[PDB]
Design a protein around this motif. Structure first.
Motif, PDB file in Angstrom:
ATOM      1  N   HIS A 185     -11.251 -10.651  15.447  1.00 14.14           N
ATOM      2  CA  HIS A 185     -10.630 -11.984  15.045  1.00 14.14           C
ATOM      3  C   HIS A 185      -9.282 -12.042  14.375  1.00 14.14           C
ATOM      4  N   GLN A 186      -8.637 -10.872  14.604  1.00 13.66           N
ATOM      5  CA  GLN A 186      -7.241 -10.611  14.116  1.00 13.66           C
ATOM      6  C   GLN A 186      -7.185 -11.258  12.558  1.00 13.66           C
ATOM      7  N   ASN A 187      -8.300 -10.761  11.966  1.00 11.71           N
ATOM      8  CA  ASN A 187      -8.535 -11.319  10.287  1.00 11.71           C
ATOM      9  C   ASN A 187      -8.386 -10.044   9.457  1.00 11.71           C
ATOM     10  N   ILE A 188      -7.919  -8.882   9.681  1.00 14.23           N
ATOM     11  CA  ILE A 188      -8.144  -7.873   8.972  1.00 14.23           C
ATOM     12  C   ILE A 188      -6.445  -7.359   8.909  1.00 14.23           C
ATOM     13  N   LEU A 189      -6.027  -6.948   7.796  1.00 14.53           N
ATOM     14  CA  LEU A 189      -4.808  -6.678   7.631  1.00 14.53           C
ATOM     15  C   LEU A 189      -4.785  -5.529   6.533  1.00 14.53           C
ATOM     16  N   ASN A 190      -4.815  -4.372   7.231  1.00 10.89           N
ATOM     17  CA  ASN A 190      -4.902  -2.933   6.315  1.00 10.89           C
ATOM     18  C   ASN A 190      -3.425  -2.613   6.169  1.00 10.89           C
ATOM     19  N   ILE A 191      -3.043  -2.219   4.895  1.00 12.65           N
ATOM     20  CA  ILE A 191      -1.737  -1.779   4.330  1.00 12.65           C
ATOM     21  C   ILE A 191      -1.972  -0.485   3.535  1.00 12.65           C
ATOM     22  N   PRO A 192      -2.036   0.776   4.442  1.00  8.33           N
ATOM     23  CA  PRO A 192      -2.253   2.136   3.881  1.00  8.33           C
ATOM     24  C   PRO A 192      -0.861   2.479   3.216  1.00  8.33           C
ATOM     25  N   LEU A 193      -0.831   3.202   2.229  1.00  2.00           N
ATOM     26  CA  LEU A 193       0.381   3.639   1.462  1.00  2.00           C
ATOM     27  C   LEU A 193       0.159   5.026   0.913  1.00  2.00           C
ATOM     28  N   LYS A 194       1.340   5.715   1.021  1.00  2.96           N
ATOM     29  CA  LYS A 194       1.415   7.305   0.824  1.00  2.96           C
ATOM     30  C   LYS A 194       1.134   7.432  -0.682  1.00  2.96           C
ATOM     31  N   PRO A 195       0.261   8.454  -1.201  1.00  2.00           N
ATOM     32  CA  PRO A 195       0.408   8.642  -2.467  1.00  2.00           C
ATOM     33  C   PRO A 195       1.855   8.576  -3.318  1.00  2.00           C
ATOM     34  N   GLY A 196       1.886   8.240  -4.534  1.00  2.00           N
ATOM     35  CA  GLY A 196       3.083   8.051  -5.226  1.00  2.00           C
ATOM     36  C   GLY A 196       3.685   6.808  -5.232  1.00  2.00           C
ATOM     37  N   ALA A 197       3.300   5.898  -4.320  1.00  2.00           N
ATOM     38  CA  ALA A 197       3.626   4.465  -4.388  1.00  2.00           C
ATOM     39  C   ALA A 197       3.884   3.820  -5.879  1.00  2.00           C
ATOM     40  N   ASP A 198       4.915   3.145  -5.888  1.00  2.00           N
ATOM     41  CA  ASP A 198       5.019   2.153  -7.362  1.00  2.00           C
ATOM     42  C   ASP A 198       5.444   0.953  -6.934  1.00  2.00           C
ATOM     43  N   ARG A 199       6.065   0.295  -7.964  1.00  2.00           N
ATOM     44  CA  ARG A 199       6.430  -1.229  -7.817  1.00  2.00           C
ATOM     45  C   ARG A 199       7.242  -1.507  -6.711  1.00  2.00           C
ATOM     46  N   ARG A 200       8.156  -0.867  -6.294  1.00  2.00           N
ATOM     47  CA  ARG A 200       9.164  -1.220  -5.122  1.00  2.00           C
ATOM     48  C   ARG A 200       8.441  -1.459  -3.886  1.00  2.00           C
ATOM     49  N   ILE A 201       7.506  -0.244  -3.452  1.00  8.11           N
ATOM     50  CA  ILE A 201       6.986  -0.278  -2.097  1.00  8.11           C
ATOM     51  C   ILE A 201       5.917  -1.544  -2.122  1.00  8.11           C
ATOM     52  N   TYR A 202       5.219  -1.915  -3.145  1.00  8.80           N
ATOM     53  CA  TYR A 202       4.087  -2.695  -3.219  1.00  8.80           C
ATOM     54  C   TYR A 202       4.730  -3.896  -3.266  1.00  8.80           C
ATOM     55  N   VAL A 203       5.912  -4.428  -4.023  1.00  9.62           N
ATOM     56  CA  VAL A 203       6.414  -5.580  -3.769  1.00  9.62           C
ATOM     57  C   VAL A 203       6.915  -5.843  -2.447  1.00  9.62           C
ATOM     58  N   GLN A 204       7.762  -4.880  -1.847  1.00  7.39           N
ATOM     59  CA  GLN A 204       8.182  -5.111  -0.477  1.00  7.39           C
ATOM     60  C   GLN A 204       7.097  -5.336   0.390  1.00  7.39           C
ATOM     61  N   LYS A 205       6.063  -4.827   0.640  1.00  9.19           N
ATOM     62  CA  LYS A 205       4.791  -4.883   1.028  1.00  9.19           C
ATOM     63  C   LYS A 205       4.280  -6.589   1.046  1.00  9.19           C
ATOM     64  N   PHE A 206       4.237  -6.991  -0.332  1.00 11.22           N
ATOM     65  CA  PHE A 206       3.926  -8.238  -0.558  1.00 11.22           C
ATOM     66  C   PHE A 206       4.740  -9.485  -0.011  1.00 11.22           C
ATOM     67  N   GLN A 207       6.114  -9.145  -0.341  1.00  9.69           N
ATOM     68  CA  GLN A 207       7.116 -10.051   0.355  1.00  9.69           C
ATOM     69  C   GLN A 207       7.156 -10.157   1.839  1.00  9.69           C
ATOM     70  N   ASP A 208       6.879  -8.950   2.526  1.00 12.22           N
ATOM     71  CA  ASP A 208       7.227  -8.773   3.759  1.00 12.22           C
ATOM     72  C   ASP A 208       6.353  -8.866   4.724  1.00 12.22           C
ATOM     73  N   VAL A 209       4.968  -8.639   4.201  1.00 11.41           N
ATOM     74  CA  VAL A 209       3.663  -8.329   5.102  1.00 11.41           C
ATOM     75  C   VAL A 209       2.556  -9.178   4.425  1.00 11.41           C
ATOM     76  N   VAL A 210       2.224  -9.379   3.185  1.00  9.38           N
ATOM     77  CA  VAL A 210       1.053  -9.897   2.462  1.00  9.38           C
ATOM     78  C   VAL A 210       1.184 -11.462   2.660  1.00  9.38           C
ATOM     79  N   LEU A 211       2.196 -11.835   1.951  1.00  8.35           N
ATOM     80  CA  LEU A 211       2.286 -13.300   1.895  1.00  8.35           C
ATOM     81  C   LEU A 211       2.639 -14.072   3.185  1.00  8.35           C
ATOM     82  N   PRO A 212       3.339 -13.402   3.902  1.00 11.59           N
ATOM     83  CA  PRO A 212       3.494 -14.252   5.089  1.00 11.59           C
ATOM     84  C   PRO A 212       2.037 -14.323   5.963  1.00 11.59           C
TER      85      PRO A 212
END
Ligand SMILES: [Zn+2]
Length: 305
Positions: free
Chosen positions: A204-231
Motif C-alpha cells: 500500500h506504499q504505507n511504510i517509510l523506513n529511514i535507516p541511519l548509520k551509527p553515530g547519528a545526532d540532531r543534525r541528521i535527524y532534523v534533516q530527515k524530519f523536515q525533508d522526509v518525515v513530515l512531507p
C-alpha cells in the motif's frame, strides 16, 4: 493541558534484577514530570481496568489466539522467559493488557480533548509480532491502538511515527497490510532487529523506513524530519498521530549507538505539531534513566506553551 496515562501496575511487570527494561524507567519519568515547572498543566489518568474494558477484541485483531493463550499460560503458571531477553512475570499478561488499555484510553482522550496524551506504559510494544513477543515486547501496543482508533467516528486514517532507535518490526508487520495506516520509522542500521530496509514500502506504499548509520545526532535527524518525515505524514493527512516514543537513540543510552540529546526530542515534537491531527505518545524503549526522564520532559514541553 497535557494528559499522562499511568498506573503503578505497570511497575509490576517483572523483568529481573538488572534487566534494562525496568520498572524504575516509569518512576524516573513520573518524578521528572512532577518536578517540572509546568507540572500543574499535566492531568494524570489511571488506565481503564481490564475488568471493565476487555482489550482482547482489539488485541485479537493483530495477535494469534495461540500466542495469546501461550503467553497467558506462561504468566499464570509462575512466569518464565519468552526468549532469553523477554521475561514474563506472573502479572505480565494482565499488565500488558492494561498497557493496551492505556493506549486505547489515550486514543479516546486525544480525540476528545485535542490535547496531547502520553501513555507511560510497560512493557513496550513495537517488536511484538502476530505470533511471538520479542525484544522486551509482549503485545503491539501502538499497532493495536491504531486499529482501535480506526473503529472510532472521525478517524479514517492513522499515522504511526516510530523514533525509538530500533526498527519497529512488529509494528510494521502488524500494520503493513492495512491501507488505513501508514508507518514511518527512523532507526539505526545496523542494529537490532536487522529489519526495515528503506526500499520496503509495503503493497500500500504505507511504510517509510529511514535507516541511519551509527553515530547519528540532531543534525541528521532534523534533516530527515523536515525533508522526509513530515512531507510523508502531511501528504497522507491522518486523523491521528501515534508516536512510538522510545528514547534509546540518545548518546547516553546503553543499548544503541546514536548520539541524540534529551532536548532533541523537543524538536521532534515541534515537527509533529505541524500536523493538524491529535497526537498520542506511547512509551517504547530508552534505558538510561536520567536521560529518559529528561527526554520525556523535552517531548512534552512544546505543548506546555
Ligand atoms: Zn528500542
Amino acid at each position: 493541558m497535557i494528559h499522562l496515562i499511568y498506573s503503578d501496575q505497570f511497575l509490576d511487570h517483572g523483568t529481573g534484577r538488572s534487566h534494562p527494561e525496568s520498572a524504575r524507567r516509569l518512576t524516573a519519568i513520573a518524578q521528572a514530570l512532577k518536578a517540572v515547572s509546568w507540572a500543574n498543566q499535566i492531568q494524570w489518568h489511571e488506565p481503564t481496568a481490564i475488568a471493565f474494558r476487555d482489550p482482547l477484541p482489539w488485541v485479537r485483531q493483530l495477535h494469534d489466539d495461540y500466542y495469546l493463550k501461550e503467553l497467558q499460560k506462561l504468566a499464570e503458571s509462575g512466569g518464565g522467559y519468552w526468549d532469553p531477553d523477554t521475561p514474563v512475570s506472573p502479572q505480565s499478561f494482565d499488565v500488558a493488557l492494561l498497557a493496551v488499555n492505556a493506549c486505547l484510553d489515550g486514543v479516546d482522550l486525544a480525540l476528545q480533548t485535542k490535547e496531547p496524551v502520553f501513555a507511560l506504559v510497560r512493557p513496550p510494544g513495537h517488536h511484538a509480532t502476530r505470533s511471538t513477543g520479542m525484544g522486551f515486547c509482549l503485545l503491539g501496543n501502538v499497532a493495536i491502538a491504531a486499529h482501535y482508533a480506526l473503529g472510532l467516528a472521525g478517524i479514517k486514517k492513522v499515522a504511526i511515527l516510530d523514533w525509538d532507535v530500533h526498527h519497529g518490526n512488529g509494528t510494521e508487520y502488524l500494520v503493513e497490510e492495512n491501507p488505513q495506516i501508514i508507518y514511518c520509522s527512523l532507526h539505526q542500521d545496523p542494529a537490532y532487529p536487522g529489519t526495515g530496509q528503506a526500499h520496503h514500502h509495503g503493497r500500500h506504499q504505507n511504510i517509510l523506513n529511514i535507516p541511519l548509520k551509527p553515530g547519528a545526532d540532531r543534525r541528521i535527524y532534523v534533516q530527515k524530519f523536515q525533508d522526509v518525515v513530515l512531507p510523508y505524514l502531511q501528504e497522507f493527512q491522518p486523523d491521528l498521530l501515534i508516536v512510538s516514543a522510545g528514547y534509546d537513540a540518545t548518546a547516553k543510552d546503553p543499548l544503541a549507538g546514536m548520539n541524540l540529546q534529551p532536548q532533541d526530542y523537543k524538536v521532534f515534537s515541534e515537527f509533529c505539531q505541524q500536523l493538524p491531527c491529535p497526537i498520542l505518545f506511547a512509551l517504547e524503549g530508552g534505558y538510561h534513566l536520567q536521560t529518559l526522564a529528561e527526554s520525556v520532559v523535552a517531548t512534552l514541553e512544546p505543548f506546555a506553551q
